[PDB]
């Protein structure tokens, strides 16, 4: 089924290629939505698509690119909106 | 690569079949390790195996079984210890 996960991702998650790498993995997996940096040092993301693909990307997000250190991911499941493609928005 | 993820999972995550369902999903994915309930109401787990399979199970754990309501997951990456099977241990 199609699902939509809204994430807030904490740790050493800025300045490490996290947005570029998340975008790469999203496009590999066919996940739609977006990712952005927030001023408090966290990363925010919306992931929408087939639940197995969304789950694969969420699991990836706890590893991140090599220099990332993800200490927690907060998740809210939402009603799918019809996201198409994955992009970096901030 | 082979990885080991040590999880704490928070939310409405006890009394919902989280341990049994995690074990079923781990066995499907070929992930070894264990899962248990903690007295603070969280679920703790160790997930060990191929990185893609481990990540799939980490992502699944943000959804859980149908009646779970996960709010956050924390992962610590660890050195593989040669876990065999996936056990419910508490």
């Amino acid at each position: 089924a199609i699902v939509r996960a809204h994430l807030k991702i904490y740790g050493r998650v800025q300045g490490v290629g996290f947005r570029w790498s998340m975008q790469r993995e999203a496009r590999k997996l066919g996940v739609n939505g977006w990712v952005r940096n927030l001023p408090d040092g966290s990363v925010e993301a919306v992931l929408e698509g087939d639940e197995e693909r969304v789950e694969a990307l969420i699991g990836w997000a706890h590893q991140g690119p090599p220099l990332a250190r993800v200490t927690r991911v907060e998740v809210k499941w939402e009603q799918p909106k019809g996201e198409k493609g994955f992009r970096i928005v901030g």
Side-chain angles (χ1 to χ4, degrees), chain A residues 59-76:
Chain A
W60 172 87
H62 281 274
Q63 186 64 267
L67 299 168
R69 188 175 71 89
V70 175
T71 59
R72 80 170 156 172
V73 171
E74 297 171 348
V75 55
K76 178 179 174 55

Side-chain angles (χ1 to χ4, degrees), chain A residues 8-11 14 37-44:
Chain A
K8 284 176 207 67
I9 304 171
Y10 301 85
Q14 300 189 359
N37 283 169
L38 293 178
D40 71 351
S42 71
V43 166
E44 183 182 13

Side-chain angles (χ1 to χ4, degrees), chain A residues 8-27:
Chain A
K8 284 176 207 67
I9 304 171
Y10 301 85
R12 185 186 176 188
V13 297
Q14 300 189 359
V16 295
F18 200 100
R19 300 172 292 167
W20 305 324
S21 299
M22 184 175 256
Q23 175 176 257
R24 174 198 70 235
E25 205 71 16
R27 291 174 175 166

